[PDB]
Amino acid sequence: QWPAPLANGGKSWASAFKKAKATVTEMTVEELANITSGVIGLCSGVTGAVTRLGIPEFCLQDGPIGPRGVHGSSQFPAGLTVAATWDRTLMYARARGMGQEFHDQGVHLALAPVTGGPLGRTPLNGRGWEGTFADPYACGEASYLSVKGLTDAGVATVSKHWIAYEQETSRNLYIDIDGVSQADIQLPISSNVDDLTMHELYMWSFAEAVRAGTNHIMCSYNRINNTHSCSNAKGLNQLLKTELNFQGGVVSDWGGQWDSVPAAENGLDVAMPGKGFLGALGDFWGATLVELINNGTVSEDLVRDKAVRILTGYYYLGQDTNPPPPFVYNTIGAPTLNATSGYRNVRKPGTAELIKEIGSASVTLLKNTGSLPLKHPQRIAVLGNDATYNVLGPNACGLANSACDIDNLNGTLTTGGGSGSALSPYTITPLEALQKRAIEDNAEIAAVVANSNTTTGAEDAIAALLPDADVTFVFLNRYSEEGADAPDFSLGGDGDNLMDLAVTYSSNVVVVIHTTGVVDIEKWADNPNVTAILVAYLPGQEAGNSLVPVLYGDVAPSGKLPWTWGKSIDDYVPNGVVYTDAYSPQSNFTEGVFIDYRWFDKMGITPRYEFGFGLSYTTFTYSNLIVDHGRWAKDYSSVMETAEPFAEWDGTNSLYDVIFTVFATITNTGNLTGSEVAQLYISIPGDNQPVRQLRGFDKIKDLPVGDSAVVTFPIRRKDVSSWSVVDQLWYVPNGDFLISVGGSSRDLPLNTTWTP
Amino acid sequence: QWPAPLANGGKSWASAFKKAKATVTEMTVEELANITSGVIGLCSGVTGAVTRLGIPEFCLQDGPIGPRGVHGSSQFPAGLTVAATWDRTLMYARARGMGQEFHDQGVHLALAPVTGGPLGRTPLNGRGWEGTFADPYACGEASYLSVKGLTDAGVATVSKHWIAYEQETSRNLYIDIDGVSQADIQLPISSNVDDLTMHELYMWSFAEAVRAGTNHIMCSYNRINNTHSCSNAKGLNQLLKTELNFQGGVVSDWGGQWDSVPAAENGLDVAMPGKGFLGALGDFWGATLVELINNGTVSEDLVRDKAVRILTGYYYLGQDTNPPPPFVYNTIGAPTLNATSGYRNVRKPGTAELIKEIGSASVTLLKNTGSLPLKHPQRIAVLGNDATYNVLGPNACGLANSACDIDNLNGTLTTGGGSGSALSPYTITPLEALQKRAIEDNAEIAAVVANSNTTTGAEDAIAALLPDADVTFVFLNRYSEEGADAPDFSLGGDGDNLMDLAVTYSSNVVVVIHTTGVVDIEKWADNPNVTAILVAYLPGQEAGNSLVPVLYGDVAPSGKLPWTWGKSIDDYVPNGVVYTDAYSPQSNFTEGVFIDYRWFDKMGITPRYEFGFGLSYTTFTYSNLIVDHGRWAKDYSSVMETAEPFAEWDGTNSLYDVIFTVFATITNTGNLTGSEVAQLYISIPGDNQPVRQLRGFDKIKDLPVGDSAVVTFPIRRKDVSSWSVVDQLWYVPNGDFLISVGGSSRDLPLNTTWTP
Ligand SMILES: CC(=O)N[C@@H]1[C@@H](O)[C@H](O[C@@H]2O[C@H](CO[C@H]3O[C@H](CO[C@@H]4O[C@H](CO)[C@@H](O)[C@H](O)[C@@H]4O[C@H]4O[C@H](CO)[C@@H](O)[C@H](O)[C@@H]4O)[C@@H](O)[C@H](O[C@H]4O[C@H](CO)[C@@H](O)[C@H](O)[C@@H]4O)[C@@H]3O)[C@@H](O)[C@H](O[C@H]3O[C@H](CO)[C@@H](O)[C@H](O)[C@@H]3O[C@H]3O[C@H](CO)[C@@H](O)[C@H](O)[C@@H]3O)[C@@H]2O)[C@@H](CO)O[C@H]1O
Ligand SMILES: CC(=O)N[C@@H]1[C@@H](O)[C@H](O[C@@H]2O[C@H](CO[C@H]3O[C@H](CO[C@@H]4O[C@H](CO)[C@@H](O)[C@H](O)[C@@H]4O[C@H]4O[C@H](CO)[C@@H](O)[C@H](O)[C@@H]4O)[C@@H](O)[C@H](O[C@H]4O[C@H](CO)[C@@H](O)[C@H](O)[C@@H]4O)[C@@H]3O)[C@@H](O)[C@H](O[C@H]3O[C@H](CO)[C@@H](O)[C@H](O)[C@@H]3O[C@H]3O[C@H](CO)[C@@H](O)[C@H](O)[C@@H]3O)[C@@H]2O)[C@@H](CO)O[C@H]1O
Ligand SMILES: CC(=O)O[C@@]12CO[C@@H]1C[C@H](O[C@@H]1OC[C@@H](O)[C@H](O)[C@H]1O)[C@@]1(C)C(=O)[C@H](O)C3=C(C)[C@@H](OC(=O)[C@H](O)[C@@H](NC(=O)c4ccccc4)c4ccccc4)C[C@@](O)([C@@H](OC(=O)c4ccccc4)[C@H]21)C3(C)C
Ligand SMILES: CC(=O)O[C@@]12CO[C@@H]1C[C@H](O[C@@H]1OC[C@@H](O)[C@H](O)[C@H]1O)[C@@]1(C)C(=O)[C@H](O)C3=C(C)[C@@H](OC(=O)[C@H](O)[C@@H](NC(=O)c4ccccc4)c4ccccc4)C[C@@](O)([C@@H](OC(=O)c4ccccc4)[C@H]21)C3(C)C
Ligand SMILES: CC(=O)N[C@@H]1[C@@H](O)[C@H](O)[C@@H](CO)O[C@H]1O
Ligand SMILES: CC(=O)N[C@@H]1[C@@H](O)[C@H](O)[C@@H](CO)O[C@H]1O
Ligand SMILES: *[C@@H]1O[C@H](CO)[C@@H](O)[C@H](O)[C@H]1NC(C)=O
Ligand SMILES: *[C@@H]1O[C@H](CO)[C@@H](O)[C@H](O)[C@H]1NC(C)=O
Ligand SMILES: *[C@@H]1O[C@H](CO)[C@@H](O)[C@H](O)[C@H]1NC(C)=O
Ligand SMILES: *[C@@H]1O[C@H](CO)[C@@H](O)[C@H](O)[C@H]1NC(C)=O
Ligand SMILES: *[C@@H]1O[C@H](CO)[C@@H](O)[C@H](O)[C@H]1NC(C)=O
Ligand SMILES: *[C@@H]1O[C@H](CO)[C@@H](O)[C@H](O)[C@H]1NC(C)=O
Ligand SMILES: *[C@@H]1O[C@H](CO)[C@@H](O)[C@H](O)[C@H]1NC(C)=O
Ligand SMILES: *[C@@H]1O[C@H](CO)[C@@H](O)[C@H](O)[C@H]1NC(C)=O
Structure with missing residues (x-):
């Protein structure tokens, strides 16, 4: 039993929360039910207005390369494409440019970015491209920066898809057209995931999303341990809203909600798309949620929290005092929605x-x-x-x-x-x-x-x-x-x-x-x-x-x-895509944390090209590894804080404190100017543990022939920890930590050992 | 009986002729026969070398937009396209640029330009596009300038195709593959053309070509009055080589030669392609012409004239002292010629x-x-x-x-x-x-x-x-x-x-x-x-x-x-293309001089868009027609002279003397800068005579709003004459000459009458 914890606004959203709660406290049951469910409109989804209190419809809009279905915009490269730059600056600027086009088209909530669902269990994933690295650390970093870029533009983020959403086949979104319902054919694939894997692999990037201040999170189409993600109390109520201390809202994927009462009790904040798409993807909480409050089945308290979580984003980004412009394009499409489109041009120089x-x-x-x-x-x-x-x-x-x-x-x-x-x-x-x-x-x-x-x-x-x-x-x-x-x-x-x-x-x-x-x-x-x-x-x-x-x-x-670029699909994690007609399809993540290069490294398998590989027109020679234990710093720059329990907690410190910083020197040893992505891997000791794990990267821009540059890798407490399943907390293990540095996950010319 | 007249070198080629004759006078019968017939090579055609006297193979090469089958060159617009500019400067520059690429690729003779065959009898002609205007005067002007541009670049011209070559269907080039010969299937179409039409319509542009100094002319695939053009004594020996005083050579179209002895006697200078193309297009004069001289059938004198006509071009353009570079591309193609190509880049800035x-x-x-x-x-x-x-x-x-x-x-x-x-x-x-x-x-x-x-x-x-x-x-x-x-x-x-x-x-x-x-x-x-x-x-x-x-x-x-752009194909000259399986196909030019707009004008037929039509983004108002009879000049600037008999001949004057000049004023009456093509038409009095005939054009470039410019039209004696079939000479008729000026063949706001 994982109770719904109450929002309090956390760190940066304290004043927004207070406003949200003041506004929510005034609402009738109809109005609570209005804002927490979708209505017909021009956007991918639209929250109901609270018209008496001057709360407008919010426009929720795909997608993770920028506003979809819209003219007068730019087509940005996909997440995959920014990952491949390994360039934090580019990661942010991209998201910031996506944000102004979102905002300037009239979007309140961007259904973006993709922050570790899918993460990369299978390299056949039809939508893996929407994400960034098949790696929790790097996905983490890019997820944080993508969120910051969108929120800094004034647009609220729905980071997606929570969680273990690692295959498109048999994802089985709810759809009830005629009597031809999906519940009558097949349940969604069930990611069966153990507690250590869920924390060290899948939750990692979503912790970063939370810390960057993602206003919302989207629960995914898949089940987890045979319970829909959108109504999985352990997933939403405890892992997300208690352990990660998530103060924002859970929006359903479109057809992610399969019932009324469990969704209401187990962590869902927003039913989408509701009355949109002909109500064909389920509409479990409109009028239905009114009757559930009024007849004593779901507490008004519980739905008030949902509404407060929705409205926090709105007030924190000043969408009350600085409203987005009207949204002008029919992005649904006739005959599902018969409405004309206007025109706006939002492409800025640069x-x-x-x-x-x-x-x-x-x-x-x-x-x-x-x-x-x-x-x-x-x-x-x-x-x-x-x-x-x-x-x-x-x-x-x-x-x-x-x-x-x-x-x-x-x-x-x-x-x-x-x-x-x-x-x-x-x-x-x-x-x-x-x-x-x-x-x-x-x-x-x-x-x-x-x-x-x-x-x-x-x-x-x-x-x-x-x-x-x-x-x-x-x-x-x-x-x-x-x-x-x-x-x-x-x-x-x-x-x-x-x-x-x-x-x-x-x-x-x-x-x-x-x-x-x-x-x-x-x-x-x-x-x-x-x-x-x-x-x-x-x-x-x-x-x-x-x-x-x-x-x-x-x-x-x-x-x-x-x-990782493997020579054969057989070289990857087995049963990456499960194909079955079984009513209740199962996908057991028996590999644990070993996905992508971690599988290859542990299993002694040679890829054609490894994770972190890419050639220049020059060569870089790596020298002079330094681990500096006096270069530590207090975590001050996270927008929001998690409540991830950790052994070394003394009331004053954080899992995201930087405990040491590591340096290396690269030299342009070839014949032409070049940029280099230096990478750092750490082998964290333990039972059944990855050969090595990415824990840093740094790209030197335009290093001339003969010149040299220092590369710097701040290491966080979390970066060196493991999840204790027994104690339910993070801890730094005992043993020798190998710290490697170089140009790829397999070209690691610098090594040293750290033992605490 | 129209005897072969002897070349004398005319006006500009006097010294080249003298050299040509000195060289030819040294040759054996084998060598005469070598240079007058084609051999295997990289070019469209190749004359045999006279190796003992250091006369190299000449490279004859398509085509009228520049060197065909060649890399490292530019694709120029077609003749049609320059016609449409009505811009003499552009007409020349185009041909001059074509010339340097021809020359710089190694071409001795360009098989270009198209100077009134086809001229434009039918608007369905598959290759009309290679020409320029469906009008003798304008085709004349563009033909003159195109020839000048090529010869000024150092390349010899083969102006084509002489004559009345007004349909592709049943053109029936000679080809003898196996025993499957064209003589066994169908003779070429026979343009049956009367004497007045041949002179006033079809010969007009070829007179201009001659006057510009076209070094050669190509006789066409068609018959005329049931005799192959390439062996039509009246056509080649009298009309071309006596009346137009043509001092250059007649090259056969590829498969234009159908016999040995008549070709030799009736005006042909060069048998092409000879041994090229497997000798499949006839090879009537190699070894065969040697035996014909040696056994008394064709006089050595006659073949000496052919060789002198070939070599005149060579010496006049200094190809002896300034040879073209080697030609490097297989433009024939495997398996007809199995030879590798080299590479040269000839594209100049500009x-x-x-x-x-x-x-x-x-x-x-x-x-x-x-x-x-x-x-x-x-x-x-x-x-x-x-x-x-x-x-x-x-x-x-x-x-x-x-x-x-x-x-x-x-x-x-x-x-x-x-x-x-x-x-x-x-x-x-x-x-x-x-x-x-x-x-x-x-x-x-x-x-x-x-x-x-x-x-x-x-x-x-x-x-x-x-x-x-x-x-x-x-x-x-x-x-x-x-x-x-x-x-x-x-x-x-x-x-x-x-x-x-x-x-x-x-x-x-x-x-x-x-x-x-x-x-x-x-x-x-x-x-x-x-x-x-x-x-x-x-x-x-x-x-x-x-x-x-x-x-x-x-x-x-x-x-x-x-x-002319007519609303229906039925609105043009009838039987523009004759389709028959008859062994000896006939095309009677019963319309006479009435082709294109002359047909439409005489027959009261309205085109959708008339000859000489094209709109601007502004308007031009035409005022102040002047006919100045004191602005006459002696023809001094023709490279070569014709021997066209004319009534007003006094031993001292020319058919191409300008007898008066006519002026008009255009004013930019609209709202934008614009260029205007002013046209002048003359109605020449007589029996069964065109409503009007183009006799001038002048393009004002970039006339600002409110500004005005004078347009000037020099009129030549020929421009006002008719062919007397009875007297076999040109004469200025009696009557009223209407002189019209304006923006199209049907937008003629200025008219006046001239009576000599
Ligand atoms: C597979 C998996 O990941 N499961 C996790 C759960 O582990 C997790 O819940 C935590 O479990 C902790 C105990 O760890 C051991 O637990 C499992 C033991 O049950 C086994 O079941 C299988 C059968 O399927 C057997 O193989 C195994 O022998 C055992 O079953 C049976 O054993 C007896 C025979 O001797 C028999 O008599 C009984 O039938 C018995 O059932 C085990 O699955 C688990 O193994 C995994 O992890 C190890 C190590 O990584 C790995 O090697 C294995 O392969 C597995 O992957 C492991 O060995 C338990 O300590 C936790 O309880 C704490 O937390 C909660 C919530 O916060 C508290 O309510 C609770 O009080 C306690 O917290 C307190 O105590 C600690 C210190 O003790 C304090 O730090 C803390 O702050 C607090 O005060 C917890 O319940 C759940 C979480 O939801 O997720 C599952 O996925
Ligand atoms: C159709 C066409 O274009 N044919 C031309 C030939 O015309 C041209 O040869 C020139 O012809 C000049 C004569 O003009 C008249 O000639 C034709 C007369 O024959 C007719 O044939 C048809 C039958 O098919 C009949 O309809 C017609 O009645 C006549 O035939 C018969 O008439 C008699 C009945 O009364 C009968 O007894 C006979 O059977 C006789 O054959 C005629 O076709 C031609 O008509 C065309 O042109 C007119 C006007 O434009 C037009 O309205 C018609 O419709 C036709 O299209 C026309 O009426 C002739 O003067 C020329 O001779 C000169 O030139 C040569 C070469 O230079 C010299 O050798 C010759 O001596 C003479 O030159 C001398 O004389 C003049 C002055 O007289 C001097 O200037 C000159 O310098 C020199 O000293 C020439 O023979 C040929 C050229 O090859 O091409 C044909 O296509
Ligand atoms: C069925 C479906 O997927 O509907 C849509 C409408 O909203 C869902 C979601 C989907 O996109 C996203 O998921 C990520 C979230 O972050 C986004 O918020 C969410 O939009 C949709 C909007 C979309 O853009 C997607 O690209 C589309 C898909 C995937 C199309 O879906 C299918 O092709 C279904 O397989 C198919 N299902 C069945 O045939 C079926 C199976 C079993 C029983 C009955 C029927 C299907 C269903 C309906 C229509 C066509 C195909 C459909 C989308 O068009 C779009 O859906 C609709 O337009 C729509 C659905 C239902 C009623 C009316 C309209 C999805 C398409 C844009 C192509
Ligand atoms: C048949 C033929 O036309 O041969 C070519 C080779 O030279 C002639 C001329 C033609 O181009 C030009 O005419 C204008 C002049 O100024 C140029 O100097 C001259 O080159 C050719 C070079 C050419 O470029 C032309 O574009 C081509 C044409 C038209 C092709 O010809 C045909 O398609 C014929 O209709 C066809 N004939 C028969 O099928 C046939 C009818 C009756 C009895 C027997 C056969 C034919 C003939 C031979 C081969 C294919 C088709 C052919 C050209 O390829 C080119 O000819 C050859 O390559 C060639 C011909 C004969 C033997 C070996 C090779 C003509 C093509 C370039 C496409
Ligand atoms: C379906 C419908 O009635 N839509 C109205 C909309 O016209 C209005 O502008 C808005 C004010 O909040 O309230 C909505 O309910
Ligand atoms: C087929 C043949 O023998 N070709 C030769 C050629 O090699 C030589 O360069 C040229 C000199 O004029 O004479 C040609 O006859
Ligand atoms: C409460 O209302 C819901 C939705 O209308 C209905 O399904 C349920 O049976 C009701 N329960 C009671 C106890 O009235
Ligand atoms: C859109 O219009 C079409 C007919 O034009 C109709 O069939 C369809 O049901 C309409 N859609 C809605 C949601 O009203
Ligand atoms: C012109 O275009 C419109 C569509 O914009 C169409 O409705 C109308 O039928 C067209 N008119 C003609 C004459 O084709
Ligand atoms: C998945 O693992 C569970 C736990 O042992 C097992 O009982 C279940 O049958 C497995 N399903 C598979 C392999 O599909
Ligand atoms: C002359 O030679 C040609 C070609 O070889 C031949 O056709 C003709 O019969 C010969 N004539 C005489 C009179 O020898
Ligand atoms: C060109 O080569 C092919 C075979 O490669 C041959 O059949 C053909 O006859 C050759 N052509 C000549 C003209 O030798
Ligand atoms: C490489 O290309 C050449 C053609 O340039 C070809 O002859 C050869 O067979 C090719 N080699 C391989 C290994 O495919
Ligand atoms: C062409 O005109 C001639 C001369 O009158 C005539 O004899 C011949 O039969 C005509 N041929 C046609 C109309 O095809």
């Missing part, structure tokens, strides 16, 4: 170049045999539909980027499909950026952008073009979307065919991959004719113009992989 | 911008209801595959731009198909130019570039996109090629469908047409939803960036139609 910079900083060089950077080649060939436009238009796939035909030539993969996608004012195609440069060089350039397998002449055109080209670019992609997991690592479209042809007719093939996750290139990776391989992830609207400068040496590539 | 300027000057505004120039629209839609790249690459259609599949999306129509096409280093697509501008405006832009009739989702994508666009661009094309005539005026690809959809979903549709000739837009032209219509012809490699500035008002459109 945004296009920030989107660019994220691209240039993210693009990750995996193989370079000598063909890059390019100098001034005269004859360029380009292969792949990914090099050009969607032939039906950049937004032809619709409001959620998922409605084009299975075989359509969608063009450059600038984002993925689903609630996490967004419209584009244009797309700067790789081919167009490459042409621009080729003109500057008085060169020629030609591209085969048809489906090579089904267009008459395409193979003959490729055979004729490639042999006289000084360089051949092949552009490959792999679309995935929310709602399904990728069946395998296979390339999308005619990727396999394009690669076969290109190696047959050219011995200087440069391969660029725009993708939602890892793909299968085993057939080509080791061919000498493939001279370079880059992965550019999901770069948003500035696809071409962020990549070409890297290709041409204007700026050296500095991105590194945010997950 | 050429891309000249190609652009020709585009900007040519694009012709046909309808403007108020939607242009654009200001700064925020939402742009674009329709049509013509807006983007060929999906297989810009040169995927091969060496003659004619080998892509019937349904391939070839992209922007930057040139036509056949021997007159050329490769492209890139193509600047309309969409890419429009995107560039749209970015500058912080606008959005989306394009449906699939085949709207056969791609799943394309019609739904168009329906969704168009209604919220501030403006919809539809890009339409119509490919034709040498070897076939267009069956009708129908749009290519899915043009009809695109236009239907666009008017259904948008009321501000702007239509841009890239075409080889007139098309059928009757279904849409009068729809209020079509707010503007432009025809951009064949703009070459700078398609997009020449059009967008005109669209946006950066420069006002100043092009005008070089032919």
